[PDB]
């Protein structure tokens, strides 16, 4: 998951998220959570999604 600082075009990354990000969005009133849907596509026989929000402060998976 990259987040682009649109002023300076500067990425901050979060690199190993056990699934490809098929949806991401900010969530809080101040934007303190990111909610993500991770598709986990190593098995091709089923579409198995992981729901993962995470607090935006230290980017730790609060409630996967």
């Amino acid at each position: 998951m990259s987040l682009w600082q649109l002023e300076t075009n500067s990425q901050q990354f979060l690199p190993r998220l056990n699934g490809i990000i098929i949806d991401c969005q900010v969530l809080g009133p101040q934007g303190n959570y990111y909610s993500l849907i991770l598709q986990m596509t190593e098995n091709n026989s089923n579409s198995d999604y992981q729901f993962l929000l995470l607090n935006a402060s230290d980017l730790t998976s609060k409630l996967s």
Binding site: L14, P15, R16, L17, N18, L59, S61
Partner: peptide, 8 residues
């Protein structure tokens, strides 16, 4: 997110 696995 995890840490990167070391090269075994």
């Amino acid at each position: 997110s995890t840490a990167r696995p070391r090269i075994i």
